[PDB]
């Protein structure tokens, strides 16, 4: 971009526009739960012991 610096000049807007922007924010994650034996062992009595 070309920007010209001046000691006695100012640029002022003469019109305006309305801009609507989106911002997506994660707020939560899936709640998970696990079981000791059913995962590590399953249904084995000896493995549970």
């Amino acid at each position: 971009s070309s920007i010209a610096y001046s000691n006695n000049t100012i640029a002022i807007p003469t019109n305006f526009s309305i801009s609507i922007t989106t911002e997506v924010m994660p707020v939560s994650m899936a709640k998970t739960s696990v079981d000791c034996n059913m995962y590590i062992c399953g249904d084995s009595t000896e493995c549970a012991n």
């Binding site: 249904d43 084995s44 009595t45």
Partner: protein
């Protein structure tokens, strides 16, 4: 005893997902369904329904 004949027989087994050929001297039991019951299917021992 070191210098004496010693008849040797080596048995090699294959436990594959194929029809069983050699089985132990166990007795089959009736089928029980819809119950958490220990089972032994051709050597596959497990707990399930």
């Amino acid at each position: 005893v070191g210098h004496q004949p010693y008849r040797v027989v080596v048995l090699s087994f294959e436990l594959l997902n194929a029809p069983a050929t050699v089985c132990g001297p166990k007795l089959s039991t009736d089928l029980i369904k819809n119950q958490c019951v220990n089972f032994n299917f051709n050597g596959l021992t497990g707990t399930g329904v």
